[model samples]
Target chain A: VCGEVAYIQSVVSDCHVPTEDVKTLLEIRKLFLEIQKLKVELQGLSKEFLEHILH
Target chain B: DVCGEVAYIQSVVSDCHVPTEDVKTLLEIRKLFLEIQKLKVELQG
Candidate 1:
């Protein structure tokens, strides 16, 4: 369910940094989205396993 | 411009918390590249 798109335009504007920096931020932003998704899935799986144990 | 989609390989690895070390590395990469770009423009001009 990771559907976050990196929108660096606002970041570029706010930071007053160049397009290069903006680009890098956007790149990392996307990475973070993946990170978030992976965490979510892992947590969900953990819960499922824990529930199985409890049940 | 090192303009290709940045591969989030390390980020996707394991649980994907994007280890702070990786974030720092990426930051350094960007800083170095931007500095390179600036130097290139200055030298060329």
Candidate 2:
């Protein structure tokens, strides 16, 4: 799995990320931030999905 | 942190996008979001 997938595993599983994957997590953190910005700089009728995700 | 990030990620799924390419990109993003949500369930099981 990619770092993001591994991190997602941690988030969903409530587990600790190993030391070896620490930097990958850090780097993937930036990618996640960029993904947010990518949509912001760019700019949903999926109401149910919106409610579930945005909460 | 996860909740805030989820909000940011989902906020990108609004209805304002109308162009063909925009809609395509929107679909892909939604797919990615759903995949993560699926991961949550997959782990829970």
Q: Which candidate number would show the highest lDDT if scored against the true structure?
A: 1
Return the lDDT, model 2, position B31: 50
- Please tell me what DockQ candidate 1 reaches: 0.02
Clashing pairs in 1: none
C-alpha displacement of B9 in model 1, angstroms?
31
Q: Score the docking of each candidate (DockQ).
A: 0.02, 0.02
The segments of candidate 1 whose C-alpha lies over 4 angstroms from its true place after superposition are A1-16, B1-45
Query: For candidate 1, lDDT tens digit of each residue in A1-55?
Result: 0111122223335676765556676566556555656677799899999999999
TM score of chain A per candidate: 0.49, 0.39
Instruction: Evaluate model 1: give its lDDT.
Output: 0.52
lDDT of 1 by residue, B1-45 (tens): 233333454334334344545444445555544555554454445
Kindly report the docking quality category of candidate 1.
Answer: incorrect
RMSD per prediction, one decimal?
19.1, 20.2
